Design a binder for this molecule. Sequence first.
Ligand code: CTP
Ligand code: SAH
Ligand code: SF4
Ligand code: CL
Ligand code: CL
Length: 291
Amino acid sequence: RTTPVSVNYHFTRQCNYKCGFCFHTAKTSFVLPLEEAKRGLLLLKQAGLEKINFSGGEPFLQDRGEYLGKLVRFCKEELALPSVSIVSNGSLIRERWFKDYGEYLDILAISCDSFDEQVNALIGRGQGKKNHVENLQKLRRWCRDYKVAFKINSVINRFNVDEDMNEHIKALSPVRWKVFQCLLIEGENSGADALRAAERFLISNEEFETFLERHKEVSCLVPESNQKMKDSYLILDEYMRFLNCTGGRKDPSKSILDVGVEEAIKFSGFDEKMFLKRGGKYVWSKADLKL
Ligand SMILES: Nc1ccn([C@@H]2O[C@H](COP(=O)(O)OP(=O)(O)OP(=O)(O)O)[C@@H](O)[C@H]2O)c(=O)n1
Ligand SMILES: Nc1ncnc2c1ncn2[C@@H]1O[C@H](CSCC[C@H](N)C(=O)O)[C@@H](O)[C@H]1O
Ligand code: SF4
Ligand SMILES: [Cl-]
Ligand SMILES: [Cl-]
């Protein structure tokens, strides 16, 4: 009964950053061959896909960004998907990629948890070599130049919960600013079998709400508490298995490449009502936006 309208494909678990709360960790080095990823994406389109978001891991890592670029163009041009988006740490994105693939990308989301360099060092977002605020503005201006909608994602955690980001976010003029409460996922950032330990990053719901109220002036803010975020996505892992988070883990279905979309998605644990409640359906085609 679940139509895969908007799906996240975490095609790699490799990353070049070390965020201490990371909930999608470097557990394998498996990435599908490009042709098999395309086959899976076609299956999703035949099942009703409208929006694909490429995630990870850091999606720009694979084949020096060309794997991601080829999938972006395939989805936009061959599948005719209404929306093709990416969530990225932004560290590896070069102007050449915009020249080659930007036409086909609706939305580029860059994760930015703080505009303070010491906070980003506490979190593990890079090694502070780049001027982070300038790099974000550089990507934002390339999104302007190459006509891609710009989005920012922030994880609200112990180290940025008191931060005032109003001016910095407005200066980047995003179409969408997703504000996530830091989320615990067993086997990723919690428990004995996890590469990360997010407990020391967590904040209460009350603290999260205080952050939201501080940023009411930002029109593009989309808030996601733990309850709004945990089960409200369709998440495909690097084997194109749906990850079910209803048990606090990322429990994989069988692969859509083996059993098909309809069989696998029955085990996704997707909460469609919450997907809608958090604003998961929106004007997501850049051709329908005013950039
Ligand atoms: N329990 C969860 C919930 C979400 N995610 C991942 O967290 C990221 C959230 O990024 P977001 O910008 O919200 O994803 P989109 O699908 O692009 O969001 P939207 O379409 O609402 O803009 C996604 O890769 C999602 O799959 C996750 O790994 N585990
Ligand atoms: N424990 C956690 N709770 C909430 N959001 C988290 C999280 N760990 C990671 N995220 C967010 O989930 C999204 C996808 S993470 C993978 C994409 C890319 N490496 C990136 O960081 O943007 C990012 O916006 C990231 O900041
Ligand atoms: S949240 Fe940080 S560590 Fe996790 S995949 Fe994104 S950049 Fe990498
Ligand atoms: Cl079609
Ligand atoms: Cl919320």
